[PDB]
């Protein structure tokens, strides 16, 4: 089958950082770039779920969402591991 499924199964329970390919998003008048952080909680043949999830905003670099999120496999651009996003990273 798809080796990526086994890879994400092996990497269960660790904090990772993901970026999608969309230019920007809007949420009731708030605009930001698609960068996410959190712990991987559940993986599926087509998508993965993160909870809790932190969204990096320019003026709110530590805002915490109240609900989990899911991301399709085909929408992932770049990602890495062994990053604790409670630390400071550049956002510009």
């Amino acid at each position: 089958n798809d080796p990526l499924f086994d890879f994400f199964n092996k990497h269960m329970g660790k904090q990772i950082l993901i970026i999608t390919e969309s230019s920007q998003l809007n949420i009731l008048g708030q605009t930001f770039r698609p960068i996410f952080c959190g712990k991987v909680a559940e993986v599926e043949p087509g998508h993965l779920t993160l909870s809790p999830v932190t969204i990096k905003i320019l003026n709110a670099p530590f805002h915490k969402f109240p609900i989990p999120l899911s991301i399709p496999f085909e929408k992932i651009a770049h990602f890495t591991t062994d990053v604790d996003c409670s630390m400071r990273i550049p956002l510009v």
Binding site: S22, G46, E74
Partner: protein, 87 residues
Amino acid sequence: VNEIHDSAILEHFRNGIGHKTLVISPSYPYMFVGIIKELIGDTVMIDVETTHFAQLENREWYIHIHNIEVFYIERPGAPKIPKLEDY
């Protein structure tokens, strides 16, 4: 592998008929919240109940799968979508 991924997404959406969900898209009007009803091909019919503008409420919409960015579907024993009430 694209066909397999699309099939997985379609099965996941099909198993959720009759539930509440939230959808975020990069295109206008950027957000839909409501009850999923059924799907046609690679398109999903949603009975929208809360969205960006009041004039675009209480009707049906059709969304292509390829423009879905993030989503969440309610499950039993799972955290509830916040009670977004117009006050």
